[PDB]
Amino acid sequence: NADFHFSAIFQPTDPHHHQTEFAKVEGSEKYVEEVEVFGRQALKVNPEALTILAHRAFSDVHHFFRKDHLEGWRRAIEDPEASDNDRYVATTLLKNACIAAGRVLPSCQDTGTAIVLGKRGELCWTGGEDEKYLSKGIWNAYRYHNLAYSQTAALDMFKECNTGDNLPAQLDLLAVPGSDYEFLFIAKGGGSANKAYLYQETKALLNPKSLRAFIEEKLKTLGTAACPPYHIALVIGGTSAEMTMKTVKLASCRYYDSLPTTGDKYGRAFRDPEWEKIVMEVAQKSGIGAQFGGKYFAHQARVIRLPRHGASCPVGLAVSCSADRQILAHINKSGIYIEQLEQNPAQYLPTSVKVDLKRPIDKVRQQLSQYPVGTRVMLNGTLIVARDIAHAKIKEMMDNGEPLPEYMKTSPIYYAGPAKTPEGYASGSFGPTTAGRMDSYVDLFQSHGGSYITLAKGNRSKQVTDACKKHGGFYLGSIGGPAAILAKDSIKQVTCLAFPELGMEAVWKIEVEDFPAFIVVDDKGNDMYSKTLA
Amino acid sequence: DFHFSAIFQPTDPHHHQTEFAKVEGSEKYVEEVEVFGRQALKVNPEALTILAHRAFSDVHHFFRKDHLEGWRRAIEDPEASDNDRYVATTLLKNACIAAGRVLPSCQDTGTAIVLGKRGELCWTGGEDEKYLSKGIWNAYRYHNLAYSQTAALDMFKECNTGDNLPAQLDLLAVPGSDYEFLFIAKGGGSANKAYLYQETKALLNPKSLRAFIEEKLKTLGTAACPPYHIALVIGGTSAEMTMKTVKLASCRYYDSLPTTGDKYGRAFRDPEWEKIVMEVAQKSGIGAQFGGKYFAHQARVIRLPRHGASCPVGLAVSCSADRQILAHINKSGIYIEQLEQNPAQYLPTSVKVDLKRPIDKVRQQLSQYPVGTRVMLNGTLIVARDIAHAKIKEMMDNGEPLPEYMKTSPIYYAGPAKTPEGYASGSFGPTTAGRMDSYVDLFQSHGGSYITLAKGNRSKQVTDACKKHGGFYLGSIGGPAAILAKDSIKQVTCLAFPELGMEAVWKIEVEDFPAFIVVDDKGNDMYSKTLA
Ligand SMILES: O=C(O)/C=C/C(=O)O
Ligand code: SF4
Ligand code: SF4
């Protein structure tokens, strides 16, 4: 008991998040009861309060965003240095927030995995069944709202099925001092969750030349498949891999913003605003921008430097996609407090080649070949919808003798999946999905008469541009993210066509009007991303 | 239509299959009480200090049964190569020196990792992290361990903490009144072999997955001191949830999980693919660091639920310094997992090289032998690792010449633990060679680093520099840090950068140092058959 000083790794100057605006659930003070046991102050919390909080959290988060997420779209619209595509995407996204704020449609069709970061106090007593009540609140949120069941169960190593409730949830409940119960609810979409990268580097990385080249290199690997502008988060170091990958996501959700900006002899975590700006240079000098070239590739950056083993240096990269969905909350003696989000997003709000898709496919391919890559396109016609699990069955068909089905050859293939349908609505949120995940099917399906035109979001591999030039194909790129405004304004009629047992991932025929898209990969060999990402 | 199903449903959550020993006189730190009809437990927070102290002390000297049962199996198996028996015997012998409680099992005493599960009605005062850190502080300060943590004064300026703090303190909230623990001393090498891959649906088929495992296992190489406890996790709710699950699988925390999934997407062990990984490991021929069958002790494959668009896969290993201890505090006191106190019950050609000659006279002798030749070094070694190279390259990048100590003796990539009383040195095992690969061609172009001594395979950029500059890379046995200090290392002297802890520059006098020629001056590599 001498030269010992304890210093926690994370020492935030606002641990209880006072800078965040909270709203109180009306009549929630009845779910708590202050008691005194062995001289210490405790809080008997009704476990039903965990169900109600998760319900309101995972409901109101799919319709609203924080200020700094909307302040990044408006900045992308008003900044002169933003490309004409930067303003177009940011306006289309900011408009999608207004349609989503109407509480009828979710902000994105990928309602995301239910993630809960709970911190139960030493003297906060709920009965122990915290997970069951929290899961019931998530179960209530996705069953009684126009959300989507996104979780895939594993019956064995390969046989899979959907759960039908967007469960199970990531329930990481921590033990903390005190008697209060603090939360951070996250609905992390699949695309952003897939752009969480772990690199195991060495001491040779720790110098301003190498680290900058590392950032230049790794930021391009994120690409546009996670619907930029991103909230880029970067963590250098850590006590373990999982501690690094957990810290980078909390940085993306902006949980560690109140951390100090200087380290010490005790190895405390700290934000580095110097290199937060250096990260903003790489993002803005990349020219990748808002999905289609420009300056605003990232809303903002968060860089956290952690302690590390003398032999270890794990670094973590992750982003928060355009569907920035996180909510802070806490339960105390005063009741249930939940973070307020911007209810009115319109206050942040201040040439196209009409393509007919009702013509023969080869007559539509001829029209698209008349224009170079980067051409703004407005689709009007029929689209076939199919994604990963639908593709997995058609290749399984062709691997046994069955031919490529006819519906793949008639209309452009729209890599997407619909959310649940509201009452009196033509469809729920029906935004595009990551294109690069179905890259392995392009050359095969094109060799059998179909998939000549594909419609999705995100850059694709070189194997697709090669397959498109050979078979005379195209890859159309929709605006990734605006799933709500595409459902209300653009999508007019939806009809399940094949594999109805697959839920949202079935084969759908949809009639579409005024669908924004860009020609990024043509039948000649050009790619709109080869300048920014290759 | 709501049914709650937790992701992890272990059939032995409290780890009854693990044998626990009670700290004598620990029942005074607990008191069973009854509050609002439910049973609670007042735990003195000083009990957290004693448990963490005892845990991080006895874990550097003893191992579990299945870790020692894997070395004995590697010695007795007929299909094991003569090198498989040699490494497993040298490691198993190293445990006997370490079981003496004077020397740690490995020079890398590892990062202090604690997975605590405090019950809803387990009361400690809230200072669990402080008291757990004090117990870790006592363990590494009052024992012959090593301070492995590096603080960050800014983005690049660094310094050591001098106490092996901070610790990874992951305290979870669980029902009940008990406080259950898992103490881990994760070494650097095994912690650097934690890999996160973002894969797709196209991976989920027996053809792709088997070849995927074949592909990624080669990346582990021998740089993490095999035989490994290979762990593989397919799926997860997030990257961090996957990387957490794979490490617990490496520490064998999820062994009591079911073996079948259900419509609720519960986690489960896949014994079918646990063997498939063991086939690839045994059919790889990489073996115990130098070719053979026993590349891995055992495998653990866990299949998690996943997003319909996500498929995170996790790869991690537990190195030869497999250090984990389970514990729990209840009304009866402090119970801590028993490790094998007597490891000897699991226990059933060299080119003598003089290193006292001029360096070029020692390089000439090594060129007479092919790769894979067993060598016994006898002479002087210069010790330098990651931070020393970063400072010496900084010297040569500003005008200062390559220092004299780099050019005189073979470069020993290692770092010593603290020295016991009346001892020549503490544990002084080798370190991962691949981390100093970026300095070979530079240092060899300026007259030094012609002979390097470490463990683990290196990149092709080093084999080119060795053939070009006429150099060698000697491969020590990775892991036996205690038996190398007692038997092989006879005299140690700090040479430069004494503020760097283990990563300082050391001059050591060495006798009978086992090593293997893996990279010669011709372009050959003994791992090109197994790892390329
Ligand atoms: O595992 C390593 O390579 C590091 C060993 C050390 O701390 O010297
Ligand atoms: S906005 Fe894009 S990245 Fe985010 S969840 Fe929706 S589709 Fe995925
Ligand atoms: S046994 Fe090898 S990998 Fe494990 S800590 Fe020691 S040196 Fe590192």
Coordinates of all heavy atoms in Angstrom, one line a residue, chain A residues 6 110 120 122 126-128 150 152 157-158 160 170 173-177 193-194 196 200 206-207 239-240 242-243 249 272 275 305 308-312 437, chain B residues 108 118 120 124-126 133 148 150 152 155-156 158 168 171-175 191-192 194 198 205 237-238 240-241 247 270 273 303 306-310 435:
Chain A
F6 N -4.4 4.2 -8.6 CA -5.3 3.6 -9.6 C -5.8 4.7 -10.5 O -6.3 5.8 -10.1 CB -6.5 3.0 -8.8 CG -7.6 2.6 -9.8 CD1 -7.6 1.4 -10.5 CD2 -8.8 3.4 -9.9 CE1 -8.6 1.0 -11.3 CE2 -9.8 3.0 -10.8 CZ -9.7 1.8 -11.5
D110 N -33.0 -1.4 -42.9 CA -32.2 -2.2 -42.0 C -32.3 -1.7 -40.6 O -31.5 -0.9 -40.2 CB -30.7 -2.3 -42.5 CG -29.9 -3.2 -41.6 OD1 -30.5 -4.1 -40.9 OD2 -28.6 -3.1 -41.7
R120 N -25.7 -1.1 -14.5 CA -26.5 -1.2 -13.3 C -25.6 -0.9 -12.1 O -24.5 -1.5 -12.0 CB -27.0 -2.7 -13.2 CG -27.9 -2.8 -12.0 CD -28.6 -4.2 -12.0 NE -27.7 -5.3 -11.7 CZ -27.9 -6.6 -11.9 NH1 -29.0 -7.0 -12.5 NH2 -27.0 -7.5 -11.6
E122 N -24.2 -0.7 -8.2 CA -24.0 -1.7 -7.2 C -25.3 -1.8 -6.3 O -25.6 -2.9 -5.8 CB -22.8 -1.3 -6.3 CG -22.6 -2.2 -5.1 CD -21.7 -1.5 -4.1 OE1 -21.4 -0.3 -4.2 OE2 -21.3 -2.2 -3.1
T126 N -33.1 -4.8 -9.5 CA -34.2 -5.0 -10.4 C -34.9 -6.3 -10.4 O -35.9 -6.5 -11.0 CB -33.7 -4.7 -11.9 OG1 -32.6 -5.7 -12.1 CG2 -33.2 -3.3 -12.0
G127 N -34.3 -7.3 -9.6 CA -34.7 -8.6 -9.6 C -33.8 -9.6 -10.3 O -34.1 -10.8 -10.2
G128 N -32.9 -9.1 -11.1 CA -31.9 -9.9 -11.8 C -32.3 -10.3 -13.2 O -31.5 -10.7 -14.0
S150 N -34.3 -8.6 -38.6 CA -33.0 -8.6 -39.3 C -32.1 -9.7 -38.8 O -31.0 -9.9 -39.4 CB -32.3 -7.3 -39.1 OG -33.1 -6.2 -39.6
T152 N -30.6 -13.5 -38.0 CA -30.6 -14.8 -38.6 C -30.1 -15.8 -37.6 O -29.0 -15.8 -37.1 CB -29.6 -14.8 -39.8 OG1 -30.1 -13.9 -40.9 CG2 -29.4 -16.2 -40.4
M157 N -24.3 -25.2 -38.4 CA -23.2 -24.3 -38.9 C -23.6 -23.6 -40.2 O -23.2 -22.5 -40.5 CB -22.0 -25.2 -39.1 CG -20.8 -24.4 -39.7 SD -20.3 -23.0 -38.6 CE -19.6 -23.9 -37.2
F158 N -24.5 -24.3 -41.0 CA -24.9 -23.7 -42.3 C -26.4 -23.5 -42.5 O -26.8 -22.5 -43.1 CB -24.3 -24.6 -43.4 CG -22.8 -24.8 -43.3 CD1 -22.3 -26.0 -42.9 CD2 -22.0 -23.8 -43.5 CE1 -21.0 -26.2 -42.8 CE2 -20.6 -24.0 -43.4 CZ -20.1 -25.2 -43.0
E160 N -29.8 -22.1 -41.8 CA -30.2 -20.9 -41.1 C -31.7 -20.7 -41.2 O -32.4 -21.3 -42.1 CB -29.4 -19.7 -41.6 CG -27.9 -19.8 -41.3 CD -27.2 -18.6 -41.8 OE1 -27.4 -18.2 -43.0 OE2 -26.3 -18.0 -41.1
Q170 N -27.9 -7.9 -28.4 CA -26.6 -7.8 -27.7 C -26.8 -7.2 -26.4 O -26.9 -5.9 -26.3 CB -25.6 -7.1 -28.6 CG -24.2 -6.8 -27.9 CD -23.2 -6.3 -28.9 OE1 -22.9 -7.0 -29.8 NE2 -22.7 -5.1 -28.6
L173 N -24.4 -6.0 -20.2 CA -24.7 -5.2 -19.0 C -23.5 -5.2 -18.0 O -23.0 -6.2 -17.6 CB -25.9 -5.9 -18.3 CG -27.4 -5.5 -18.7 CD1 -27.5 -5.3 -20.2 CD2 -28.4 -6.5 -18.2
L174 N -23.1 -4.0 -17.7 CA -21.9 -3.8 -16.9 C -22.3 -3.5 -15.4 O -23.4 -2.9 -15.2 CB -21.1 -2.6 -17.4 CG -20.5 -2.8 -18.8 CD1 -19.7 -1.6 -19.2 CD2 -19.6 -4.0 -18.9
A175 N -21.4 -3.8 -14.5 CA -21.6 -3.5 -13.1 C -20.8 -2.3 -12.7 O -19.6 -2.2 -12.9 CB -21.1 -4.7 -12.2
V176 N -21.5 -1.2 -12.3 CA -20.9 0.1 -12.0 C -21.3 0.5 -10.5 O -22.3 -0.1 -10.0 CB -21.4 1.1 -13.0 CG1 -20.9 0.8 -14.4 CG2 -22.9 1.3 -13.0
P177 N -20.6 1.4 -9.9 CA -20.9 1.9 -8.6 C -22.2 2.7 -8.7 O -22.8 3.0 -9.7 CB -19.8 2.8 -8.2 CG -18.6 2.3 -9.1 CD -19.2 1.8 -10.4
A193 N -22.1 -2.2 -39.4 CA -21.5 -3.2 -38.5 C -20.5 -4.0 -39.3 O -19.6 -4.6 -38.7 CB -22.6 -4.1 -37.9
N194 N -20.6 -4.2 -40.6 CA -19.7 -4.9 -41.4 C -18.4 -4.1 -41.7 O -17.4 -4.7 -42.2 CB -20.3 -5.3 -42.7 CG -21.3 -6.5 -42.5 OD1 -21.2 -7.3 -41.6 ND2 -22.4 -6.5 -43.3
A196 N -16.6 -2.6 -39.5 CA -15.8 -2.6 -38.3 C -14.5 -3.5 -38.6 O -14.7 -4.7 -38.8 CB -16.5 -3.2 -37.1
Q200 N -4.0 -5.7 -36.7 CA -2.9 -5.9 -35.7 C -1.6 -5.4 -36.2 O -0.9 -6.0 -37.0 CB -2.8 -7.4 -35.4 CG -4.1 -8.0 -34.8 CD -4.2 -7.8 -33.3 OE1 -3.3 -7.1 -32.7 NE2 -5.1 -8.5 -32.6
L206 N 3.8 3.7 -35.3 CA 3.7 4.8 -34.5 C 4.7 5.9 -34.9 O 5.8 6.1 -34.2 CB 3.8 4.4 -33.0 CG 2.9 3.3 -32.5 CD1 3.1 2.9 -31.1 CD2 1.4 3.8 -32.7
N207 N 4.4 6.6 -36.0 CA 5.1 7.8 -36.4 C 4.2 8.5 -37.4 O 3.4 7.9 -38.1 CB 6.5 7.4 -37.0 CG 6.3 6.5 -38.3 OD1 6.0 7.0 -39.4 ND2 6.5 5.2 -38.0
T239 N -6.0 -2.8 -24.6 CA -5.6 -3.9 -23.8 C -5.9 -5.3 -24.4 O -5.3 -6.3 -24.0 CB -6.3 -3.8 -22.4 OG1 -7.7 -3.9 -22.6 CG2 -5.9 -2.5 -21.8
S240 N -6.8 -5.3 -25.4 CA -7.1 -6.5 -26.1 C -7.8 -6.2 -27.4 O -8.2 -5.0 -27.6 CB -7.9 -7.5 -25.3 OG -9.2 -6.9 -24.9
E242 N -10.9 -7.3 -28.4 CA -12.3 -7.0 -28.1 C -12.4 -5.6 -27.4 O -13.4 -4.9 -27.7 CB -12.9 -8.1 -27.3 CG -12.3 -8.3 -25.9 CD -11.1 -9.2 -26.0 OE1 -10.5 -9.4 -27.1 OE2 -10.6 -9.7 -24.9
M243 N -11.5 -5.3 -26.6 CA -11.5 -4.0 -25.9 C -11.3 -2.9 -26.9 O -11.8 -1.8 -26.8 CB -10.5 -3.9 -24.8 CG -10.5 -2.7 -23.9 SD -9.5 -1.4 -24.6 CE -9.6 -0.2 -23.3
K249 N -16.4 1.3 -31.5 CA -17.8 1.5 -31.7 C -18.4 2.6 -30.8 O -19.2 3.4 -31.2 CB -18.6 0.2 -31.6 CG -20.1 0.3 -31.7 CD -20.8 -1.0 -31.8 CE -20.9 -1.5 -33.2 NZ -19.6 -1.8 -33.9
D272 N -7.6 12.5 -29.4 CA -6.5 13.2 -30.0 C -7.2 14.2 -31.1 O -7.3 13.8 -32.2 CB -5.5 12.3 -30.6 CG -4.2 13.0 -30.8 OD1 -4.1 14.2 -31.2 OD2 -3.1 12.4 -30.5
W275 N -5.1 14.6 -34.4 CA -5.2 13.6 -35.4 C -6.7 13.4 -35.8 O -6.9 12.7 -36.9 CB -4.6 12.2 -35.0 CG -3.1 12.3 -35.1 CD1 -2.2 12.8 -34.2 CD2 -2.4 11.8 -36.2 NE1 -1.0 12.6 -34.7 CE2 -1.0 12.0 -35.9 CE3 -2.7 11.2 -37.4 CZ2 0.0 11.7 -36.8 CZ3 -1.7 10.8 -38.3 CH2 -0.4 11.1 -38.0
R305 N -6.6 7.3 -28.4 CA -5.4 6.6 -28.2 C -5.4 5.8 -26.9 O -5.6 6.4 -25.8 CB -4.2 7.5 -28.2 CG -2.8 6.9 -27.9 CD -2.4 6.0 -29.0 NE -0.9 5.8 -29.1 CZ -0.3 4.9 -28.4 NH1 -0.9 4.0 -27.6 NH2 1.0 4.8 -28.5
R308 N -1.4 0.1 -24.3 CA -1.1 -1.2 -25.1 C 0.0 -1.9 -24.5 O 0.9 -1.4 -23.8 CB -0.8 -0.8 -26.6 CG 0.5 0.0 -26.7 CD 0.8 0.1 -28.2 NE 2.1 0.8 -28.3 CZ 3.3 0.2 -28.4 NH1 3.3 -1.2 -28.3 NH2 4.4 0.8 -28.5
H309 N 0.0 -3.2 -24.7 CA 1.1 -4.1 -24.4 C 2.3 -3.7 -25.2 O 2.2 -3.2 -26.4 CB 0.8 -5.6 -24.7 CG 1.7 -6.6 -24.1 ND1 3.0 -6.7 -24.5 CD2 1.5 -7.5 -23.2 CE1 3.6 -7.7 -23.8 NE2 2.7 -8.2 -23.0
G310 N 3.5 -3.8 -24.6 CA 4.8 -3.4 -25.3 C 5.0 -4.2 -26.6 O 5.7 -3.7 -27.5
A311 N 4.3 -5.3 -26.8 CA 4.4 -6.1 -28.0 C 3.2 -6.0 -28.9 O 3.2 -6.5 -30.0 CB 4.7 -7.6 -27.7
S312 N 2.1 -5.5 -28.3 CA 0.8 -5.4 -29.1 C 0.5 -4.0 -29.5 O 0.9 -3.1 -28.8 CB -0.3 -6.0 -28.2 OG -0.2 -7.4 -28.1
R437 N -21.6 -7.4 -51.8 CA -21.9 -8.8 -51.3 C -22.4 -9.7 -52.3 O -22.2 -11.0 -52.1 CB -22.8 -8.6 -50.1 CG -22.1 -8.2 -48.8 CD -23.1 -7.7 -47.7 NE -24.5 -8.2 -48.0 CZ -25.6 -7.6 -47.6 NH1 -25.5 -6.4 -47.1 NH2 -26.8 -8.1 -47.9
Chain B
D108 N 7.0 -12.9 -20.8 CA 5.9 -12.0 -21.1 C 4.8 -12.3 -20.1 O 3.9 -13.1 -20.4 CB 5.4 -12.1 -22.6 CG 4.3 -11.1 -22.9 OD1 4.0 -10.2 -22.1 OD2 3.6 -11.3 -23.9
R118 N -20.4 -9.6 -11.0 CA -20.9 -9.3 -9.7 C -22.5 -9.5 -9.7 O -23.2 -9.0 -10.6 CB -20.6 -7.9 -9.4 CG -21.0 -7.4 -8.0 CD -20.5 -6.1 -7.6 NE -21.2 -5.0 -8.3 CZ -20.7 -3.8 -8.4 NH1 -19.6 -3.4 -7.9 NH2 -21.4 -2.9 -9.1
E120 N -26.4 -9.2 -8.5 CA -27.3 -8.1 -8.2 C -27.2 -7.8 -6.7 O -27.3 -6.6 -6.3 CB -28.7 -8.4 -8.6 CG -29.7 -7.4 -8.1 CD -31.1 -7.9 -8.2 OE1 -31.3 -9.1 -8.4 OE2 -32.1 -7.0 -8.0
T124 N -19.9 -4.8 -2.6 CA -18.4 -4.6 -2.4 C -18.0 -3.2 -2.0 O -16.9 -3.0 -1.6 CB -17.6 -5.0 -3.6 OG1 -18.0 -4.2 -4.7 CG2 -17.9 -6.5 -3.9
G125 N -18.9 -2.2 -2.1 CA -18.6 -0.8 -1.9 C -18.4 0.0 -3.2 O -18.2 1.2 -3.1
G126 N -18.4 -0.6 -4.3 CA -18.3 0.0 -5.6 C -16.9 0.2 -6.1 O -16.7 0.4 -7.3
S133 N -7.3 -3.8 -9.1 CA -6.1 -3.3 -9.6 C -5.0 -3.4 -8.5 O -3.8 -3.6 -8.9 CB -6.2 -1.9 -10.1 OG -7.1 -1.9 -11.3
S148 N 4.6 -4.9 -18.5 CA 4.5 -5.0 -19.9 C 3.6 -3.9 -20.5 O 3.5 -3.9 -21.8 CB 3.8 -6.4 -20.3 OG 4.6 -7.5 -19.8
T150 N 2.5 -0.2 -21.8 CA 3.1 1.0 -22.4 C 2.1 2.1 -22.4 O 1.0 2.0 -23.0 CB 3.6 0.7 -23.8 OG1 4.7 -0.2 -23.7 CG2 4.0 2.0 -24.5
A152 N 0.8 6.1 -23.1 CA 0.8 7.0 -24.3 C 0.7 8.4 -23.8 O -0.4 8.9 -23.4 CB -0.3 6.7 -25.3
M155 N 0.1 10.9 -29.0 CA -0.1 9.9 -30.0 C 1.1 9.0 -30.3 O 0.9 7.8 -30.6 CB -0.6 10.6 -31.3 CG -0.8 9.6 -32.5 SD -2.1 8.4 -32.2 CE -3.6 9.5 -32.1
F156 N 2.3 9.5 -30.1 CA 3.5 8.7 -30.4 C 4.4 8.5 -29.2 O 5.0 7.5 -29.0 CB 4.2 9.2 -31.6 CG 3.3 9.3 -32.8 CD1 2.9 10.6 -33.3 CD2 2.9 8.2 -33.4 CE1 2.1 10.7 -34.4 CE2 2.1 8.3 -34.6 CZ 1.7 9.5 -35.0
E158 N 5.8 7.6 -25.8 CA 5.3 6.5 -24.9 C 6.3 6.4 -23.8 O 7.4 6.8 -23.8 CB 5.2 5.2 -25.7 CG 4.1 5.2 -26.7 CD 4.1 3.8 -27.4 OE1 5.1 3.3 -27.8 OE2 2.9 3.3 -27.6
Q168 N -7.4 -4.8 -17.9 CA -8.7 -4.9 -18.6 C -9.7 -5.3 -17.6 O -9.8 -6.5 -17.2 CB -8.6 -5.8 -19.8 CG -9.9 -6.0 -20.5 CD -9.8 -6.6 -21.8 OE1 -9.2 -6.1 -22.7 NE2 -10.4 -7.8 -22.0
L171 N -16.4 -5.8 -15.8 CA -17.3 -6.1 -14.7 C -18.7 -6.2 -15.2 O -19.3 -5.1 -15.6 CB -17.1 -5.2 -13.6 CG -16.1 -5.4 -12.5 CD1 -14.8 -5.9 -13.1 CD2 -15.8 -4.2 -11.7
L172 N -19.3 -7.4 -15.2 CA -20.7 -7.6 -15.7 C -21.7 -7.7 -14.6 O -21.3 -8.1 -13.5 CB -20.7 -8.8 -16.6 CG -19.9 -8.8 -17.9 CD1 -20.0 -10.1 -18.6 CD2 -20.3 -7.6 -18.8
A173 N -22.9 -7.3 -14.9 CA -24.0 -7.4 -13.9 C -24.8 -8.7 -14.1 O -25.4 -8.9 -15.2 CB -24.9 -6.2 -14.0
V174 N -24.9 -9.5 -13.1 CA -25.5 -10.8 -13.2 C -26.5 -11.0 -12.0 O -26.3 -10.3 -11.0 CB -24.5 -12.0 -13.2 CG1 -23.6 -11.9 -14.5 CG2 -23.6 -11.9 -12.0
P175 N -27.5 -11.8 -12.2 CA -28.4 -12.1 -11.1 C -27.6 -12.8 -9.9 O -26.5 -13.3 -10.1 CB -29.5 -13.0 -11.6 CG -29.4 -12.8 -13.1 CD -28.0 -12.5 -13.4
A191 N -2.2 -12.4 -28.0 CA -3.1 -11.3 -28.1 C -3.0 -10.6 -29.5 O -3.9 -10.0 -30.0 CB -2.9 -10.2 -27.0
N192 N -1.8 -10.7 -30.1 CA -1.6 -10.2 -31.5 C -2.2 -11.1 -32.5 O -2.3 -10.7 -33.7 CB -0.1 -10.0 -31.7 CG 0.4 -8.8 -31.0 OD1 -0.4 -7.8 -30.7 ND2 1.6 -8.8 -30.6
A194 N -5.2 -12.3 -32.5 CA -6.7 -12.2 -32.5 C -7.1 -11.4 -33.8 O -6.8 -10.2 -34.0 CB -7.2 -11.4 -31.3
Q198 N -14.5 -9.8 -41.8 CA -15.8 -9.5 -42.1 C -16.1 -10.2 -43.4 O -15.8 -9.8 -44.5 CB -16.0 -8.0 -42.3 CG -15.8 -7.1 -41.1 CD -17.1 -7.1 -40.2 OE1 -18.1 -7.8 -40.5 NE2 -17.1 -6.2 -39.2
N205 N -20.7 -22.5 -46.3 CA -20.8 -23.8 -47.0 C -19.6 -24.6 -46.7 O -18.5 -24.1 -46.5 CB -21.0 -23.7 -48.5 CG -19.9 -23.0 -49.2 OD1 -18.9 -23.5 -49.5 ND2 -20.1 -21.7 -49.4
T237 N -23.3 -10.8 -32.8 CA -24.1 -9.6 -32.9 C -23.3 -8.4 -33.3 O -23.9 -7.4 -33.7 CB -24.9 -9.4 -31.6 OG1 -23.9 -9.1 -30.6 CG2 -25.7 -10.6 -31.3
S238 N -22.0 -8.4 -33.1 CA -21.1 -7.3 -33.5 C -19.7 -7.8 -33.5 O -19.4 -9.0 -33.1 CB -21.2 -6.2 -32.5 OG -20.8 -6.5 -31.2
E240 N -17.1 -6.6 -31.8 CA -16.6 -6.7 -30.4 C -17.2 -7.9 -29.7 O -16.5 -8.6 -28.9 CB -16.8 -5.5 -29.7 CG -18.3 -5.1 -29.5 CD -18.8 -4.3 -30.8 OE1 -18.1 -4.3 -31.8 OE2 -19.9 -3.7 -30.7
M241 N -18.5 -8.2 -30.0 CA -19.1 -9.4 -29.4 C -18.5 -10.7 -29.9 O -18.4 -11.7 -29.2 CB -20.6 -9.4 -29.7 CG -21.4 -10.5 -29.0 SD -21.6 -12.0 -30.0 CE -22.7 -12.9 -29.0
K247 N -12.0 -15.1 -27.7 CA -11.0 -15.1 -26.6 C -11.5 -16.0 -25.5 O -10.7 -16.8 -24.9 CB -10.7 -13.7 -26.1 CG -9.8 -13.8 -24.9 CD -9.3 -12.4 -24.5 CE -8.1 -12.0 -25.4 NZ -7.5 -10.7 -25.1
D270 N -19.6 -26.4 -32.0 CA -19.7 -27.3 -33.1 C -18.6 -28.3 -33.0 O -17.5 -28.1 -33.6 CB -19.7 -26.6 -34.4 CG -20.3 -27.3 -35.5 OD1 -20.1 -28.6 -35.6 OD2 -21.0 -26.7 -36.4
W273 N -16.9 -29.4 -36.5 CA -15.9 -28.5 -37.1 C -14.7 -28.3 -36.1 O -13.7 -27.8 -36.6 CB -16.5 -27.2 -37.5 CG -17.2 -27.4 -38.8 CD1 -18.5 -27.8 -39.0 CD2 -16.7 -27.1 -40.1 NE1 -18.9 -27.8 -40.3 CE2 -17.8 -27.4 -41.0 CE3 -15.5 -26.7 -40.7 CZ2 -17.7 -27.3 -42.4 CZ3 -15.4 -26.6 -42.0 CH2 -16.4 -26.9 -42.9
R303 N -20.7 -21.3 -32.9 CA -21.5 -20.7 -33.9 C -22.5 -19.8 -33.2 O -23.3 -20.2 -32.4 CB -22.2 -21.7 -34.8 CG -23.2 -21.2 -35.8 CD -22.4 -20.5 -36.9 NE -23.2 -20.3 -38.1 CZ -24.1 -19.4 -38.4 NH1 -24.2 -18.4 -37.5 NH2 -24.8 -19.3 -39.5
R306 N -26.4 -14.1 -36.2 CA -25.8 -13.0 -37.0 C -26.9 -12.2 -37.7 O -28.0 -12.7 -37.9 CB -24.9 -13.6 -38.0 CG -25.5 -14.5 -39.0 CD -24.6 -15.0 -40.1 NE -25.2 -15.7 -41.2 CZ -25.7 -15.1 -42.3 NH1 -25.6 -13.8 -42.5 NH2 -26.3 -15.9 -43.2
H307 N -26.6 -11.0 -38.0 CA -27.4 -10.2 -38.9 C -27.5 -10.9 -40.3 O -26.5 -11.5 -40.7 CB -26.9 -8.8 -39.0 CG -27.9 -7.8 -39.6 ND1 -28.3 -7.9 -40.9 CD2 -28.5 -6.7 -39.1 CE1 -29.1 -6.9 -41.2 NE2 -29.2 -6.2 -40.1
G308 N -28.7 -10.7 -40.9 CA -28.8 -11.3 -42.3 C -27.8 -10.8 -43.3 O -27.6 -11.4 -44.3
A309 N -27.3 -9.6 -43.0 CA -26.3 -9.0 -43.9 C -24.8 -9.1 -43.4 O -23.9 -8.8 -44.1 CB -26.6 -7.5 -44.2
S310 N -24.7 -9.5 -42.1 CA -23.4 -9.5 -41.4 C -23.0 -11.0 -41.2 O -23.8 -11.9 -41.0 CB -23.4 -8.8 -40.1 OG -23.5 -7.4 -40.3
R435 N 8.0 -8.9 -36.0 CA 7.7 -7.5 -35.7 C 8.8 -6.6 -36.0 O 8.6 -5.4 -36.2 CB 7.2 -7.4 -34.2 CG 5.8 -7.7 -34.0 CD 5.5 -8.0 -32.6 NE 6.4 -7.5 -31.6 CZ 6.7 -8.0 -30.5 NH1 6.2 -9.2 -30.1 NH2 7.6 -7.5 -29.7

